[PDB]
PDB file of C-alpha atoms in Angstrom:
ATOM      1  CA  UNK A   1      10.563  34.219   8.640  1.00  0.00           C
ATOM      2  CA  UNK A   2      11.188  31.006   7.406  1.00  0.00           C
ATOM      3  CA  UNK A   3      12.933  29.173   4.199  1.00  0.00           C
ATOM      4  CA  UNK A   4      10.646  27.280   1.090  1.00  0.00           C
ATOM      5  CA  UNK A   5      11.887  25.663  -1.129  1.00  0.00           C
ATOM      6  CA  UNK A   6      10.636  26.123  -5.251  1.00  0.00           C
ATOM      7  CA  UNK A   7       9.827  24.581  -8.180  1.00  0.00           C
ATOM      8  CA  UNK A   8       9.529  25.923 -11.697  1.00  0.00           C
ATOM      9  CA  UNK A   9       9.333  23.480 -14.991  1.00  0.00           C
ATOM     10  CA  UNK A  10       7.941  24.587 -18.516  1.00  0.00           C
ATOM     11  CA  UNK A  11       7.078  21.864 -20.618  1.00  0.00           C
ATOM     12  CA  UNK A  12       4.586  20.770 -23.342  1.00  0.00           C
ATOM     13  CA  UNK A  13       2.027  18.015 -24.023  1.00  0.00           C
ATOM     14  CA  UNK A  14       0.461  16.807 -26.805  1.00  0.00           C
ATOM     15  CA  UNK A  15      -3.356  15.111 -26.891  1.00  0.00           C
ATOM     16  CA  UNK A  16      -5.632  13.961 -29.610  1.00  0.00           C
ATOM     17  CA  UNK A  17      -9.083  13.939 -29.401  1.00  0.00           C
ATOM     18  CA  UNK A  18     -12.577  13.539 -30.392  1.00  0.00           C
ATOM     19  CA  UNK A  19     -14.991  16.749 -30.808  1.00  0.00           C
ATOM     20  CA  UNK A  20     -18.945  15.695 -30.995  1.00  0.00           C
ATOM     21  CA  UNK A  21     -21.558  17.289 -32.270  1.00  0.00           C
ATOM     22  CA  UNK A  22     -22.928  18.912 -29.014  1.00  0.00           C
ATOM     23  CA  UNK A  23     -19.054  20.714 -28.797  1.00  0.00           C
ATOM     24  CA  UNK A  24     -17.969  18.884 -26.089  1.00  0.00           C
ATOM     25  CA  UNK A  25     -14.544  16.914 -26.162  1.00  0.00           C
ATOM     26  CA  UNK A  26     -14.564  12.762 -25.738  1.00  0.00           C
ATOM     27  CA  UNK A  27     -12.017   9.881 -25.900  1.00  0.00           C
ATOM     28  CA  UNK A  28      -9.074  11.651 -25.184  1.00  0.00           C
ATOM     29  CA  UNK A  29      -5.936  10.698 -24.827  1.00  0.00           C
ATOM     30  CA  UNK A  30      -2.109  11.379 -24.346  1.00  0.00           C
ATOM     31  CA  UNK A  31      -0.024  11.499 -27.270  1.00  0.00           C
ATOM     32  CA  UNK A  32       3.503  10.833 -24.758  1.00  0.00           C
ATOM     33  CA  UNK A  33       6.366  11.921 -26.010  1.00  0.00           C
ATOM     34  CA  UNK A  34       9.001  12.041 -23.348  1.00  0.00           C
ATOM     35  CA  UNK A  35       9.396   8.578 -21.932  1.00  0.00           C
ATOM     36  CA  UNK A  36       6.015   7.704 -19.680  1.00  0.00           C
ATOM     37  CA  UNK A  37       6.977   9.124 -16.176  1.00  0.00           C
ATOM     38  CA  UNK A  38       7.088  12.839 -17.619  1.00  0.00           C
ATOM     39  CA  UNK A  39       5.758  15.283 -14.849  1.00  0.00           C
ATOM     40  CA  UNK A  40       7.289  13.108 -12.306  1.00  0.00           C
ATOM     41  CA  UNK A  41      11.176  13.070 -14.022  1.00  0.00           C
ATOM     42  CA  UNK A  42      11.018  16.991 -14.494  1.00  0.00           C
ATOM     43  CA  UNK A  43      10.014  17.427 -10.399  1.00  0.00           C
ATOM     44  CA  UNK A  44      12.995  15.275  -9.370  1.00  0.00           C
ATOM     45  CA  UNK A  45      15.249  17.217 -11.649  1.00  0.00           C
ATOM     46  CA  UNK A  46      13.944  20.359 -10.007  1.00  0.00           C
ATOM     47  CA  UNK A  47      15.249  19.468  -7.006  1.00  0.00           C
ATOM     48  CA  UNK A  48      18.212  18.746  -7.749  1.00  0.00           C
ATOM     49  CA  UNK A  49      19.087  22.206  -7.588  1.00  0.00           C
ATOM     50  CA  UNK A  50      17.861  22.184  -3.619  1.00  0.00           C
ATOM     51  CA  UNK A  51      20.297  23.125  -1.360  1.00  0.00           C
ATOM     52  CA  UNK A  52      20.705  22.392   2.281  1.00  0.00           C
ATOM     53  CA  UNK A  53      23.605  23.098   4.777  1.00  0.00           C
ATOM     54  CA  UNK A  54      26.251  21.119   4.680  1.00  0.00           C
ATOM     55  CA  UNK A  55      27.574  18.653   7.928  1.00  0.00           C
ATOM     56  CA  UNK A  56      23.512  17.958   9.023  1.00  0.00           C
ATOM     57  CA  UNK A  57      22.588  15.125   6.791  1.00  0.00           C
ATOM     58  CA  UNK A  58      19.596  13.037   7.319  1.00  0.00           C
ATOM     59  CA  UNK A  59      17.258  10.347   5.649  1.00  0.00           C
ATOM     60  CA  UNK A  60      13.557  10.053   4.857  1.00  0.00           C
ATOM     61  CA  UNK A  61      12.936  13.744   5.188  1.00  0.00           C
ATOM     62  CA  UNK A  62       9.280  14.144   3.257  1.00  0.00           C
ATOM     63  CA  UNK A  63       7.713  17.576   2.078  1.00  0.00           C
ATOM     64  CA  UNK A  64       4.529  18.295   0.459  1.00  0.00           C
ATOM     65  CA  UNK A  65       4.615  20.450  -2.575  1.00  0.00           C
ATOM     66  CA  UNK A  66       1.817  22.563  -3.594  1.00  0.00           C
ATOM     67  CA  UNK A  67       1.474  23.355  -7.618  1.00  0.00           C
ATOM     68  CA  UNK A  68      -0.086  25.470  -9.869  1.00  0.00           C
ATOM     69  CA  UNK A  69      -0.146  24.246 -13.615  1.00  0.00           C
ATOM     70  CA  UNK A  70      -0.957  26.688 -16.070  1.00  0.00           C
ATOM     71  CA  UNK A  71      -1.458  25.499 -19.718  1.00  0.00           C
ATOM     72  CA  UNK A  72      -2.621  27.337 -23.731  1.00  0.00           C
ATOM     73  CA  UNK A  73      -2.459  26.085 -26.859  1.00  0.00           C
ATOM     74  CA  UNK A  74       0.772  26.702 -29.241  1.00  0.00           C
ATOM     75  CA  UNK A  75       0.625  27.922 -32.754  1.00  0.00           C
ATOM     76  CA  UNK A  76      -2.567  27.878 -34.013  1.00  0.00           C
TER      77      UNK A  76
ATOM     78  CA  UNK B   1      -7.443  37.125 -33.464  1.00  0.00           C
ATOM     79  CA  UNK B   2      -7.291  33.756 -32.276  1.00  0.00           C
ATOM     80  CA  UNK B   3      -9.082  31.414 -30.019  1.00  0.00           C
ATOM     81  CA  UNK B   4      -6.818  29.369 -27.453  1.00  0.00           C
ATOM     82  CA  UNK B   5      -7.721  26.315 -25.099  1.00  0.00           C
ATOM     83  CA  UNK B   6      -6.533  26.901 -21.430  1.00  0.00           C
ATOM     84  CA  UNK B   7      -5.549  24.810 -18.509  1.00  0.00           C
ATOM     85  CA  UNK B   8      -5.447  25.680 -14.711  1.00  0.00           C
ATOM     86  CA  UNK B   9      -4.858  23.118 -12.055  1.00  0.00           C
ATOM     87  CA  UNK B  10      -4.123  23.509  -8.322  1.00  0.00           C
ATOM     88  CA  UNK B  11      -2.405  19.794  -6.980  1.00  0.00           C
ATOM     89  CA  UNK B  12      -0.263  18.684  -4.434  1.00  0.00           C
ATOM     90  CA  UNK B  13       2.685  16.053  -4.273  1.00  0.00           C
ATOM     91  CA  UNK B  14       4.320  14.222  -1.439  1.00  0.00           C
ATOM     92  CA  UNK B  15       8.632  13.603  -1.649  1.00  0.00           C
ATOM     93  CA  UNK B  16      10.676  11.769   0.514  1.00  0.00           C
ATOM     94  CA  UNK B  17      14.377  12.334   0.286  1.00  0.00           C
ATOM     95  CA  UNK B  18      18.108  11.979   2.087  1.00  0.00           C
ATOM     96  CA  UNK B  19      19.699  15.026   2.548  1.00  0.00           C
ATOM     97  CA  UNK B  20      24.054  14.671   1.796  1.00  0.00           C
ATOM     98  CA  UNK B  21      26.878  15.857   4.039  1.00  0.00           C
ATOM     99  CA  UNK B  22      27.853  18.044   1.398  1.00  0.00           C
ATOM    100  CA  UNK B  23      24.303  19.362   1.288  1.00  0.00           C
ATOM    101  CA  UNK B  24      22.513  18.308  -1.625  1.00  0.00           C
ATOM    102  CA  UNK B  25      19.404  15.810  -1.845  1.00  0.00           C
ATOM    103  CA  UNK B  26      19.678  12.401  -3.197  1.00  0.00           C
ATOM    104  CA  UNK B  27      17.433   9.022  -3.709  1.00  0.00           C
ATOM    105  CA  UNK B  28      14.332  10.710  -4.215  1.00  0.00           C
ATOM    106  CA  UNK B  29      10.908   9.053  -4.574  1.00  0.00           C
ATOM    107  CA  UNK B  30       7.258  10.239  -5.042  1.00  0.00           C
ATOM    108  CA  UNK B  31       5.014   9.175  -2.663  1.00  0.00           C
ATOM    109  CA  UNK B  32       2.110   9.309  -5.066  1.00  0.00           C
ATOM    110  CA  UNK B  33      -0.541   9.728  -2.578  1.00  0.00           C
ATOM    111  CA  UNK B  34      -3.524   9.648  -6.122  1.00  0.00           C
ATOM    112  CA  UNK B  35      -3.824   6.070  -8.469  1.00  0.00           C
ATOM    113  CA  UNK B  36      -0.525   6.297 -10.111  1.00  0.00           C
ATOM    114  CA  UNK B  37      -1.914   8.025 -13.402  1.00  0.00           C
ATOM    115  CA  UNK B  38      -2.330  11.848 -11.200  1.00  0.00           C
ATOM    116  CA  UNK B  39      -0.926  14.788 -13.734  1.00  0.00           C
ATOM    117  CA  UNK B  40      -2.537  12.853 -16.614  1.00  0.00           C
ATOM    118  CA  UNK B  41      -6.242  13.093 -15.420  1.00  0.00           C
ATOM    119  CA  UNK B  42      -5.966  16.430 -13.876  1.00  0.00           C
ATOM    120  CA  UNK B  43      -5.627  17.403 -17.820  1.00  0.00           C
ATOM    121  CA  UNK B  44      -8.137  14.901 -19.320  1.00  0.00           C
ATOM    122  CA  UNK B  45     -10.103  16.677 -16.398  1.00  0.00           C
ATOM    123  CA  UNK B  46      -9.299  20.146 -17.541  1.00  0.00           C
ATOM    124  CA  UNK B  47     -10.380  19.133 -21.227  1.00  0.00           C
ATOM    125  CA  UNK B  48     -14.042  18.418 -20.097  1.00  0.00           C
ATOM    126  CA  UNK B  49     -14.492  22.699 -19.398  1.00  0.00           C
ATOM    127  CA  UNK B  50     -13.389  22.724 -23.495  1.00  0.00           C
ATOM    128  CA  UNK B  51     -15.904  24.270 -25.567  1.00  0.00           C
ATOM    129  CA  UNK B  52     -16.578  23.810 -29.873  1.00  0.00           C
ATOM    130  CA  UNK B  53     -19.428  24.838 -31.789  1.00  0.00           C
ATOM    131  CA  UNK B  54     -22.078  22.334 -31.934  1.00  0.00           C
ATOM    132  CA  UNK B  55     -22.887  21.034 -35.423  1.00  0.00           C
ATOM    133  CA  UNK B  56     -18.696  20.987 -36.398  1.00  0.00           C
ATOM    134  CA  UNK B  57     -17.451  17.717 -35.441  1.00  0.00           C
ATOM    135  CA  UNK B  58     -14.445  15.828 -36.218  1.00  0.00           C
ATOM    136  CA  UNK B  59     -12.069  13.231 -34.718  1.00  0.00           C
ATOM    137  CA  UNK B  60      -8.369  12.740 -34.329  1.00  0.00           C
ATOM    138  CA  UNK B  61      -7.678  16.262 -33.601  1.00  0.00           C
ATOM    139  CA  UNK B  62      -4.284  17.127 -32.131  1.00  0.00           C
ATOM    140  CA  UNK B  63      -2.880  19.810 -30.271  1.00  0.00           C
ATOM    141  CA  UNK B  64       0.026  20.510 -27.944  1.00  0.00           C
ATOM    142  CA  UNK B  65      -0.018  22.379 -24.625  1.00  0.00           C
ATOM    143  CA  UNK B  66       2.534  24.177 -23.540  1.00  0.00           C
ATOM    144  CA  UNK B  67       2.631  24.628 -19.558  1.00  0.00           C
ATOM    145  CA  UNK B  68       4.504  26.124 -17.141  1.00  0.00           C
ATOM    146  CA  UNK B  69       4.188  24.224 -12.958  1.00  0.00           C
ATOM    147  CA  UNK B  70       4.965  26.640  -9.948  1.00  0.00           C
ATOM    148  CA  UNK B  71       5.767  24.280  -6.934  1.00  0.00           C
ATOM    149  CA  UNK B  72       6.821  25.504  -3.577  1.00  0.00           C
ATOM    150  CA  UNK B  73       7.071  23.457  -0.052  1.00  0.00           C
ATOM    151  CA  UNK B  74       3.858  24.335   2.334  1.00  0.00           C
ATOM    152  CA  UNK B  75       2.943  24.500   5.912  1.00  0.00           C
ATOM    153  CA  UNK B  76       7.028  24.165   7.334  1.00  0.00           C
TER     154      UNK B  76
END
Protein backbone atom coordinates (compact mmCIF):
# COMPACT_ATOMS: atom_id res chain seq x y z
CA UNK A 1 0.00 0.00 0.00
CA UNK A 2 1.18 3.29 -0.01
CA UNK A 3 1.26 6.59 2.40
CA UNK A 4 -1.20 10.05 1.67
CA UNK A 5 -0.96 12.61 3.23
CA UNK A 6 -4.45 14.72 4.68
CA UNK A 7 -6.00 17.73 5.10
CA UNK A 8 -8.92 18.74 7.27
CA UNK A 9 -9.87 22.66 8.03
CA UNK A 10 -13.40 23.90 9.28
CA UNK A 11 -13.94 27.37 8.79
CA UNK A 12 -16.67 29.96 7.98
CA UNK A 13 -17.45 32.69 5.42
CA UNK A 14 -19.56 35.37 5.31
CA UNK A 15 -21.29 36.94 1.85
CA UNK A 16 -23.86 39.56 1.18
CA UNK A 17 -25.96 39.60 -1.56
CA UNK A 18 -28.64 40.64 -3.82
CA UNK A 19 -31.96 38.40 -4.27
CA UNK A 20 -34.15 39.52 -7.55
CA UNK A 21 -37.36 39.09 -8.27
CA UNK A 22 -37.06 35.91 -10.49
CA UNK A 23 -35.26 34.18 -7.02
CA UNK A 24 -32.08 34.01 -8.33
CA UNK A 25 -28.97 35.51 -6.39
CA UNK A 26 -26.78 38.60 -8.13
CA UNK A 27 -23.87 40.92 -7.15
CA UNK A 28 -22.36 38.95 -4.67
CA UNK A 29 -19.66 39.38 -2.82
CA UNK A 30 -17.21 38.40 0.07
CA UNK A 31 -17.66 39.94 3.28
CA UNK A 32 -13.55 38.85 4.36
CA UNK A 33 -12.95 38.60 7.60
CA UNK A 34 -9.70 36.83 8.20
CA UNK A 35 -6.97 38.77 6.48
CA UNK A 36 -7.41 38.28 2.38
CA UNK A 37 -5.36 35.02 1.72
CA UNK A 38 -7.90 32.88 3.92
CA UNK A 39 -8.26 29.32 2.29
CA UNK A 40 -4.72 29.52 1.29
CA UNK A 41 -3.20 30.40 5.16
CA UNK A 42 -5.43 27.53 6.70
CA UNK A 43 -3.84 24.80 3.88
CA UNK A 44 -0.28 25.81 4.81
CA UNK A 45 -1.09 25.50 8.45
CA UNK A 46 -2.43 22.05 7.70
CA UNK A 47 0.63 20.94 6.74
CA UNK A 48 2.45 21.84 9.14
CA UNK A 49 1.49 18.92 10.96
CA UNK A 50 3.07 16.65 7.87
CA UNK A 51 5.56 14.46 8.83
CA UNK A 52 8.35 12.88 6.90
CA UNK A 53 11.39 10.72 8.00
CA UNK A 54 13.98 12.27 9.35
CA UNK A 55 17.94 12.29 7.70
CA UNK A 56 16.28 12.36 3.77
CA UNK A 57 15.68 16.00 3.27
CA UNK A 58 15.04 17.49 -0.04
CA UNK A 59 13.78 20.74 -1.88
CA UNK A 60 11.04 21.59 -4.36
CA UNK A 61 9.10 18.45 -3.69
CA UNK A 62 5.38 19.41 -5.27
CA UNK A 63 2.05 17.40 -4.59
CA UNK A 64 -1.33 17.91 -5.87
CA UNK A 65 -4.09 17.96 -3.38
CA UNK A 66 -7.51 16.97 -4.19
CA UNK A 67 -10.51 18.72 -1.98
CA UNK A 68 -13.87 18.41 -1.18
CA UNK A 69 -15.57 21.61 0.36
CA UNK A 70 -18.71 21.12 1.96
CA UNK A 71 -20.66 24.25 3.13
CA UNK A 72 -24.67 25.19 5.08
CA UNK A 73 -25.85 28.04 6.45
CA UNK A 74 -25.46 28.82 10.42
CA UNK A 75 -28.23 29.91 12.66
CA UNK A 76 -31.04 30.82 10.90
CA UNK B 1 -38.22 23.24 10.23
CA UNK B 2 -35.83 25.25 8.48
CA UNK B 3 -34.54 25.87 5.06
CA UNK B 4 -30.58 25.92 4.65
CA UNK B 5 -28.32 27.02 1.59
CA UNK B 6 -25.63 24.34 0.71
CA UNK B 7 -22.27 24.26 -0.88
CA UNK B 8 -20.34 21.31 -2.55
CA UNK B 9 -17.17 21.79 -4.47
CA UNK B 10 -14.64 19.24 -5.79
CA UNK B 11 -10.98 21.37 -6.55
CA UNK B 12 -7.54 20.68 -6.71
CA UNK B 13 -4.30 22.58 -5.50
CA UNK B 14 -0.68 22.32 -6.46
CA UNK B 15 2.29 22.77 -3.29
CA UNK B 16 5.77 22.89 -3.58
CA UNK B 17 7.77 22.42 -0.44
CA UNK B 18 11.44 21.49 1.29
CA UNK B 19 11.32 18.70 3.34
CA UNK B 20 13.86 19.26 6.93
CA UNK B 21 16.48 16.86 8.28
CA UNK B 22 14.51 16.62 11.24
CA UNK B 23 11.52 15.77 9.08
CA UNK B 24 9.11 18.41 8.92
CA UNK B 25 8.13 20.67 5.78
CA UNK B 26 9.10 24.21 5.50
CA UNK B 27 8.93 27.33 2.86
CA UNK B 28 5.82 26.39 1.38
CA UNK B 29 4.16 28.07 -1.62
CA UNK B 30 0.95 27.54 -3.71
CA UNK B 31 1.41 27.08 -7.08
CA UNK B 32 -1.97 28.51 -7.94
CA UNK B 33 -2.41 26.81 -11.15
CA UNK B 34 -6.42 29.09 -11.52
CA UNK B 35 -6.34 33.37 -11.76
CA UNK B 36 -5.29 34.02 -8.28
CA UNK B 37 -8.97 34.63 -6.93
CA UNK B 38 -9.72 30.27 -7.06
CA UNK B 39 -11.70 29.33 -3.57
CA UNK B 40 -13.56 32.66 -3.92
CA UNK B 41 -15.37 31.91 -7.30
CA UNK B 42 -15.83 28.30 -6.72
CA UNK B 43 -18.43 29.83 -3.98
CA UNK B 44 -19.78 32.83 -5.97
CA UNK B 45 -20.14 29.75 -8.41
CA UNK B 46 -21.93 27.60 -5.93
CA UNK B 47 -24.36 30.63 -5.11
CA UNK B 48 -25.73 30.69 -8.76
CA UNK B 49 -27.62 26.85 -7.95
CA UNK B 50 -29.36 29.20 -4.88
CA UNK B 51 -32.96 29.28 -5.11
CA UNK B 52 -35.75 32.22 -3.45
CA UNK B 53 -39.23 32.64 -4.20
CA UNK B 54 -39.86 34.85 -7.03
CA UNK B 55 -41.86 37.99 -6.22
CA UNK B 56 -39.70 38.43 -2.53
CA UNK B 57 -36.78 40.45 -3.28
CA UNK B 58 -34.41 42.31 -1.25
CA UNK B 59 -30.75 43.43 -1.20
CA UNK B 60 -27.88 43.44 1.22
CA UNK B 61 -28.65 40.15 2.62
CA UNK B 62 -25.97 38.44 4.71
CA UNK B 63 -25.21 35.13 5.73
CA UNK B 64 -22.26 33.07 6.93
CA UNK B 65 -21.19 29.61 5.76
CA UNK B 66 -19.72 27.42 7.76
CA UNK B 67 -17.49 24.70 5.83
CA UNK B 68 -15.54 21.99 6.48
CA UNK B 69 -12.35 21.06 3.29
CA UNK B 70 -11.18 17.31 3.11
CA UNK B 71 -7.75 17.40 1.24
CA UNK B 72 -5.63 14.39 0.66
CA UNK B 73 -2.40 13.95 -1.80
CA UNK B 74 -3.48 11.96 -5.22
CA UNK B 75 -2.01 9.75 -7.80
CA UNK B 76 1.65 9.02 -5.59
Amino acid sequence: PARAQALRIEGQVKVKFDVTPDGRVDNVQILSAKPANMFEREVKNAMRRWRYEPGKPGSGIVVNILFKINGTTEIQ
